[PDB]
Every structure is written in C-alpha cells, then in structure tokens.
Write a protein that binds this ligand. Structure first.
Ligand code: EVA
Ligand code: EVA
Lengths: 596, 596
C-alpha cells in the first residue's frame, strides 16, 4: 500500500507505545487453534514495548526461542475520536505480525523493519477499551527477507539458523500506535527536488488524497510561503532555494491539504531541496563531489535487542557528531524512521538498506544458492516487496542519497545475475531520483563478481589483514590497493568502502600491535586510510562498526562482534580518537588530498 | 649421544645460564659465512638466558623473526677443573643450535626440547676465559618436529608457517651448564621397578661405566643402604616395598659408583618403586586403579616465552596442588626436566609427550599428508629420533607413567596406519616398562579413526559444544556420550580425556550462560563431568588448558588461546573453583560414583 508518517495536527496519535504489555511464549503452537486473541493472555508476564523480547528477561530459553510469541494489551479509544478515520499502526514488528482487535483480525505483515497499519474505524467504538493481541513470528526461511532455515530436531523443537552476522532479535521493536484522520485524507506524497547550479530550482509534487482536492504550499524554516500549487496531483514549484546540505540540512516544509466538500485534511512534509547524482567516479550532492565518512551501524544495545530508544539515539548522534562522521548506512535492515528524521534535520547523509543480507552460503546446506530449494522466484518477489516497502517509506527523506538492495550476496554463480538484474531495474523504476547499489562481499572481488555493473556506485566490504593476510598490514595494504584499482578500471564508478574494521577487545593492549588489540585496530584503519587517499575512485569510508553488537554464538565471535569503535555501552576504544582526528581534520564533505 | 642429568657430588657444574648473553639477529644470513663466532657479535644487545628471544624486547619485528639468531657469552673456566672431563650442556635450544668455543665448532642439534652435550676439554684452558657463540635457528619444515613450511616473500624475507595451535617461541629456553667429570666416568644408567602386590620387590639396574667397575648401592631416603650389587652391568634388589605412590611419591637413591685406578666417579640417581600397566579398561598404579585429574599444560608465560623459570614452576605447582590436579601432560613438546623431578619428588603423575604435533592438515597446500611432499620416511626418522631422545632423558623418571608418541595426527589419509605402526613398535621396545599412546583429534572419531589399536590407552581431545554443537550443551552431551560409548565397543581400552576445554574471557559474565563467558566454561566443564562419570572406561580428565597461552595470530584466537582455567598471569577464572571442588571432593586417584 501507501505509507505516510503519522504527524499531528488535524490528525492525532495515541501512543500505546506505552511499554507494558502482556507476553507469553507459544511453545506448543496452541495459540491460533485456541484463539488466544479471544481472551486475556494466560500465563503472561510483563514486557516492554518498543523492544526486542529476547534480552528483557535475562533468560537463555526465551532468548533462543524460535516460533510464536504473544503480546497483549487493553487500550482506550479517545472519546473525541467520534467519526474520524481511526488507524492502528505498527512501525515495526520483527519478522511477522498478526494483529487482532477483540477477536477481529485486522492486519498481517511479513517484514521485520517497516510499518504496517489498518483502518480500524469500523472495529472500535470511541470511549471504549479494546483488547489488542499481536502474534509475532521470528522464523526465517528461503522466502523471508532476510533468509534462514529453521531446523527442527528429532524432538520437534525448532532452532533458527541464519547466515548474517547479527543476532536474530525479534518482537515489537518500534512504536505501535493508534492514529486519526478525517474521512478525506492525504495518504501518499512523492516529492522530487531539482537544482540547477544552485541559484534556482523546481520541486515537483505528486499527491494521492483519498477523496480530496489538494493544494500545496512551501514554507521556509522561518515559516513564510515561498511557493504555491494546485494541480492537486502533479504540481511543480520554482524557488530561489536554501539547499538541504550535508553540513546543515536546511528544511523547507510542504503543506498538503485534502479538501472534501465538508472535510479538511492537513499534512506537513519536511522537504530538503537537494540533488543526488553520480557523475563518472564522483558522488555529487547539490552538484558538488562529496566524500562519505562514518559508520555501518546496527540497531543494538544492552537489554534492548533492536528496540528503538530516544536516549540511545540522542547519545549515538552526539558520538557520531563528535567523531566527525558525516554519514552512515542502515546496515542490514531499514532503521527506525526517527533516525531518518534526525538525519534530515541535521544534514546527515544516509545509505538506506533493505533487510536483504544472508543471500550467501559461503560467509563462514543447499548446494545451489539460486535454486528452487533456496533463492528462487518467490524469494525474488519477497525481495522486490522489501524494496517497495522501504522506498515507499523513505522516498521523501532528503538524507537518503542512495538505496542499497542487499548486503553481500554470493555473486559467483550464474543466476545471481538472473536474480538481481530484475531487482536493479525495478528499484530504479521505484525511485528514479537516487543511485542504487548492492553491497559487495570480499570474496566476490573485482575479477569474480558478476553483478556490480548493474548498479551505480560500488560499495565494498573489505577485510584484508583480518580474515585474510591476518595480522599482516604490509601485504594487506598491497592486496587492498591492487583490488580497489582493479574495480576502478573495471567499472569507473564511485567506490565507497562501506565496511572496514577489525575485532578489538577494549582494554586489550599490545606492544606487538597484533590482532584484537586496540593498537592493531588503530594501525589497521590507518593503513586502510593511506590507501583510500591514494585512490581517486574512493569517495567514502564507513568503518565497520559504530559499536560492538550481539551475534549468534560461535568460535569467531567473543561474546559478539567486536569491531566497534565504541563498546556496546558506548565507551570509546582508542581508535575512536584516531577517527576523530582524520574526520574533524578534513575539509567537511571533502576528500583528503592524499597527504596530511 | 648418551644422556644423564648433571648433578653435584665429586662432579661440578657452573651454569652459564647466568642470564646476560650478547644477542643479534642475522637478517642477512651472513652469520655462518663470516664465522661470526670468531669475534664479538657487533650490533649486539643484551638478552636473558634461559628464555625465548621473541618477547624479551617488546618488538614485533623480532617476535616474528624467522632464521638465525646469534647468542654469545664469555666464561672463565674454573681452576680446579683441569684434567677433569668437562661437558658443555644445553638442556634445550629451541629448534636448532650450532656452538663454537673460540673458533672451534663443538656441537649441532635438531630438537628444541631436549639436551645436547659435548666434551670441550681440548678446546678450553682452565682458569682462562673462552668465548661461547651459538647459532639458533627457529625454522620448521616437513623433516622437522613439529613440522612447518617456511615461505620467502616477494620482497625476499622469510615467514614461518606451522600447524600447531601454540606460538613458535624460539631461543635458548632452558639452562646452559659447563659440567665436570673424572677422566673415567658414568654417562648412562637405566632402572626398572617390579612390585608384585606391594610385597617386597626388585629394581633392576643396567648401567654404562666408561672404563670402570661399579659398586651400585641403593639407599633409603635416610641414606641407609638397603641393597647392593657389584654387577655394574646387570642386577636386582629386593626388600619390603615402600611404594612410590601418587599421594606423596616416596623415593629411594641409587649411588652409581664407577671405579678406575686413579679416579672414582659417584653418580646419584633417584628411584621410585611403582608399577604401571593396563588391565582391560583400567590404568593401574602399583597394581591399583588410578583416575587422572589435572591438565594439559604448556610452557608459556609473560615475558620469557617458553623459557624455564623457578618462581613460575613453584607457583604453578602450588596451584595444581591446590586445585586437586594429580596429573598433567607435557603438551606438544617435552618439558623442562626440573618439572619431572618435582613430579617425582611430590608424586605427581605425568603423561610425557614428544614435540610431534601438527601432522594434520584439517585442524584450522600439499595434497597427501603422508607423502614425499609432506610427511615421508625422513620425517618418520626424526619422529623416531625425537622419541629416542625423550625416552633417553625421561626413562628413569618414575613420575612418567606413559609415553605420548604424538598429539593429534590426521589418521584419515592413506598411510596413517603404515606410519604409526612401526614407530609404535620402536617405542614399545625402547621402553617396555611404560604404556604408550597417541592423542586423538575430534574429526578422527571412533568410526573414522585408524591407528587407535596400536596403543594401550585411549587419549581423546574433545570439543563437542565448542567447535561443533557450538553453545549447545544438550546435543553436545549426547554426541559425547554416544562417542565415548562407541569407544568402549571398538576397543576396551582405558580412556583418558587429555583435552576438554572452552575459550573463556576472564571477566566475561553472562546471564545467558553462552560461549566465551565464565559461566559457560563452568556449565560445559560440568557437563563433560556428568558424562565422564557414566563411562566405566573413562580413566581420566585433563582439562585444556591450565592457563591462557600465546598462539600465532588469527581470527580464532583473541589473546592467544583462552581455554586456560587460569589466565596467563595465573589468576583464576570461576572454573578454577568448579574443578577445585570436584578434584578435592574425590577420593585420591579414584573415580566418582557415576553419581555424587
Ligand atoms: O564479519 C564482519 O565483521 C562483517 N563483515 C561483513 O562483510 C558483513 O557485511 C557484516 O555483516 C559483518 O558483520
Ligand atoms: O584448539 C584448542 O582448544 C586445543 N585443542 C586441541 O585439540 C589441540 O591439542 C590443542 O593444541 C589446541 O590448543
């Protein structure tokens, strides 16, 4: 469908992101048979929402649970809600959610990281209390996005195995809410912003107003109307603009009005006037070459598996700001929209990424990745859908300068191309206004990768000197430089190293500057930087990883992934100061001149 | 060469192990060419001996060095040693040494864990200073024990590669001593103990008098002669037994007197009256069921690498005693003989092991492990040769109950059985008195493993739950039991678990009791224990490792190896208390009731 972001004015929100909900596991999978949504959840403990369910109770068995869990909550419809359009929305429900308003199934969703909502007007009475039961599923398979394989052992007990390097946290990770609109309501806006050598431009609009004529006005930061439009559908605005720019992100405001004969609806959409374009080996923003700095991030913290939190967001952005990061990539799933609102407001450049990681069977059972058994026509449709829902969500955020379709598919087999070519094309139809990318795994190098020509920007995840040439900066450096030059000459695209990093145990110090030591982390990033500055095609550097985060258990992960610049409690490792010096020492948004 | 532990009676030694020798790297491999041994090493620096050269200087470039290093030292010969036999002895020089005394090449050795000695009387003048120069080589190859491959880079320098987990520390690891003897002397002995039902029984001497007759009296701990023979070549002695027992380890003393016309050489040996053999599923200590507790250990410590150190030895034994260890294995190389005197004297049980580890290519470039390319006849000789020298050294140490011919060879390839059958043969003949073993890796399991039948005791290194069934105690327990039971069937041989362990970060704590957490170590060690007990065949437990220790760099090793019950600075992890409680809550040398 269509997704607008709930704002208040004529339209109003009840939070119900009030956190305390009833919660129980459904170990027997009785829940649907017995219609638990029909009465109060039995044997139910208190849980916080928004939040992962896994870590809230410090219990291994709830953490490692695979299958169905139930959230239940009673809530009060505002009396004043009367005959307005009432909508129940979930910003996210991890992997799968099915929702009941009082023994009435109102919605269903597969996707752990984007919103789903249903008009509930007919199913609720204003001034009365309703029971809300969500059945949440955390299972992955070959058609889920990201993919996985549940293994049931001989006892019929499920266990989730998956192919990506973060932990499969689940639950209601983001805001759930009740919200209002008039029976005439704006429900889709699409803004495209053009700029022409930065003295003037046009901002096209496209508007869907469920039964309403629309009018448009564009306002300053200091709230004065600078352009108007009728053409309630397709209306183009000309301006002497304050451009939304990486440093500051100046935001205009577009007010969308849906008028019925008796009814009004008012939707304000923040707009940054900026162009994004690749020209040759450059990534241009408002027609200037940009240089990315900053991180691949995760949504991860102690006690919240991936649950959204405002303090964590305020804090992490103070860190990213302090360190001189100008960008990030929503590694491995769409992030909370609050994050993109922040980025828009603060002029943070973002690479927006679907949840399509784990397409790889060689990261470290089926023998063909592209297979009817394993990655197939159904998967591709699920993949396209994931792309659709992400673009439908994030299309108007000026902070998003690029779409990332997938992280680290195995592109060696013939068929990778078969599978990805249509997604690349589809994606571009969905959004013509942004470069497109597919993040690239180390072993699909310049000579073996089959897919990268189909996208606009080259985003490489590189670990030379870590997973390969381990401990050896000297030969690490040679392989890295040779690889990046090969890519440059092969594709003549802008290259962003979207991942480079080494596990570092905070407090592990070594005179020998060897693996897993603060000093090795320092020397290794430093060597990588030396190379980047020698390669003109390199247009960006995003360190892996903002902070330590949880993964599945194994021999390769010491209590988790330790490639953070900060620890999970947001303590700086000495590499944090190193990056601070490089990033705050550069000219903003500008690439070093390959010397101090 | 004939091998006797120098001791002080009518015989004298001056340790040159007084530590400060002059040291140099020969990066240019000029050393031999220019007879560096003829003049003071230039570009020299002070180094301590006994100790690894690698970590003494906090320099990576020295730590990772492969090739020849030069040790030089001047020493005033004592005036009272003038027409006496003078012997220069190195208890160990890691990998290879070439020794000169003032431009006089005196000795050469391959094998980093056993002594080598030569008479220097002709090349040295008593009351004068002579210059000692040593060429130490750390390079390993296929002919070497343990094996390795050395690669010369595209730039021209050497880098070592090897297949055993611990770090390749090299240098002069054990003491060097000048050594005195009469012109007629003892250079060999051998003793055997027979004890039938702990009634009085006999000790057969066999000796080598280098031109003398011997009187050979046995003394009690009170120097009270309780038996005598004059047959300097073969005897027997019989009295009410007084057993060398694992509890306290009582010893007798055998004066070996060797007579010439002008000179008498009294050599003293220590003797522990005890019996070791297998009956079916049981390892019997003096005809009585023993159950092993204690560790796989290494020679590794903070700044000395594998260099011997008395304080470290005193301290480690305090800890093993405290924790209830009765046994350990000289992991993957033979230890400093001081360790074996301690075990003899305190009655500790020792599974003695050669340096033959890393025969395997699957632990984590040649096609066939046993082949001209990889392991060949030549390699089988050195293996033999290494086994010769060990038994030559430790044959008389009562604490040694059993030989471990090697650690973790891959027996799946073709020829594995052909390789080990003859070496098994040669060893049984070399010491008929002690049982013999080969320590077995996880992936050569009961059904897959060849070559388990040629050995008397089954020594298993098992990791279920940690490398496989990663983090899963429940399945790991079943696999382990079925595995161990499957082992009682194929053979009804005594089973000792020589390694069972999990990497654990001191200070990593988890409510989820997951991998690399102090808790997990406890839970996992606990789990092996419940299984261990149920198997009648299980004669012992030896935890991997005693303490954290260095390894070559890689993504699987964080500090180095972290499976230590103690950290490298000897601080206990919570699992030290788990073991303490079991190993002292037992009856000594006995098995638990397969229940409390
Ligand atoms: O293994 C890593 O450290 C990271 N490398 C990658 O290439 C992946 O894109 C990341 O998910 C992963 O966390
Ligand atoms: O990897 C380990 O935890 C240990 N397991 C083994 O089987 C080896 O005998 C040891 O060297 C090694 O350190």
């Amino acid at each position: 469908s269509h997704m607008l972001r709930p704002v208040e004015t004529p339209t109003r929100e009840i939070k119900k992101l009030d956190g305390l909900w009833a919660f129980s596991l459904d170990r027997e999978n009785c829940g649907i048979d017995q219609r638990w949504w029909e009465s109060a959840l039995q044997e139910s403990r208190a849980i916080a929402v928004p939040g992962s369910f896994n870590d809230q109770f410090a219990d291994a068995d709830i953490r490692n649970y695979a299958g169905n869990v139930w959230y239940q909550r009673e809530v009060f419809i505002p009396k004043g809600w009367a005959g307005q359009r009432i909508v129940l929305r979930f910003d996210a429900v991890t992997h799968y959610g099915k929702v009941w308003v009082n023994n009435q199934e109102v919605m269903e969703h597969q996707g752990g990281y984007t919103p789903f909502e249903a008009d509930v007007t007919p199913y609720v009475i204003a001034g009365k209390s309703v029971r809300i039961t969500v059945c949440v599923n955390n299972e992955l398979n070959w058609q889920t996005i990201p993919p996985g394989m549940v293994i049931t052992d001989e006892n019929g007990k499920k266990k989730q195995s998956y192919f990506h390097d973060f932990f499969n946290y689940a639950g209601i990770h983001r805001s759930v809410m009740l919200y209002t609109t008039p029976n005439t309501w704006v429900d889709d806006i699409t803004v495209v912003t053009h700029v022409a050598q930065d003295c003037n431009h046009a901002s096209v609009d496209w508007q869907v107003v469920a039964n309403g004529d629309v009018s448009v006005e564009l306002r300053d930061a200091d709230q004065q109307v600078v352009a108007t439009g009728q053409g309630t559908s397709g209306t183009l605005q000309v301006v002497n603009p304050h451009l939304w720019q990486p440093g500051e992100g100046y935001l205009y405001e577009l007010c969308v009005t849906a008028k019925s004969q008796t009814e009004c609806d008012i939707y304000p959409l923040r707009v940054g006037i900026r162009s994004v374009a690749v020209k040759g080996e450059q990534f241009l923003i408002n027609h200037k070459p940009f240089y990315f700095t900053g991180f691949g991030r995760h949504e991860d913290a102690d006690l919240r598996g991936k649950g959204f939190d405002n303090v964590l967001m305020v804090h992490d952005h103070a860190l990213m700001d302090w360190i001189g990061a100008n960008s990030y990539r929503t590694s491995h799933y769409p992030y909370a929209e609050e994050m993109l609102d922040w980025a828009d407001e603060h002029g943070i450049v973002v690479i927006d990424e679907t949840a399509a990681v784990g397409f790889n069977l060689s990261l470290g059972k089926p023998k063909e990745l592209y297979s009817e058994e394993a990655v197939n026509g159904e998967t591709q449709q699920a993949h396209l859908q994931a792309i659709k829902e992400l673009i439908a969500r994030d299309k108007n955020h000026p902070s998003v300068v690029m779409w990332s379709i997938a992280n680290e598919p195995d592109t060696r087999p013939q068929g990778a191309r078969e599978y990805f070519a249509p997604l690349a094309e589809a994606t571009r139809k969905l959004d013509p206004t942004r470069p497109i990318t597919c993040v690239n795994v180390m072993f699909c190098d310049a000579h073996t990768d089959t897919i990268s020509d189909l996208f606009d920007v080259l985003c490489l995840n590189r670990y030379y000197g870590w997973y390969v040439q381990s401990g050896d900066l000297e030969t690490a450096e040679k392989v890295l430089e040779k690889e990046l030059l090969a890519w440059q000459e092969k594709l003549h695209q802008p290259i962003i190293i979207t991942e480079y990093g080494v596990d570092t145990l905070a407090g592990l110090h070594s005179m020998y500057t060897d693996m897993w030591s603060e000093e090795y982390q320092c020397a290794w990033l430093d060597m990588y930087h030396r190379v980047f500055d020698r390669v003109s095609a390199v247009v960006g550097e995003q360190v892996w990883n903002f902070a330590d985060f949880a993964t599945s258990q194994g021999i390769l992960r010491v209590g988790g992934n330790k490639k953070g610049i900060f620890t999970r409690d947001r303590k700086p490792k000495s590499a944090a100061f190193l990056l601070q010096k490089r990033w705050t020492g550069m000219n903003f948004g500008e690439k070093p001149q390959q010397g101090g």
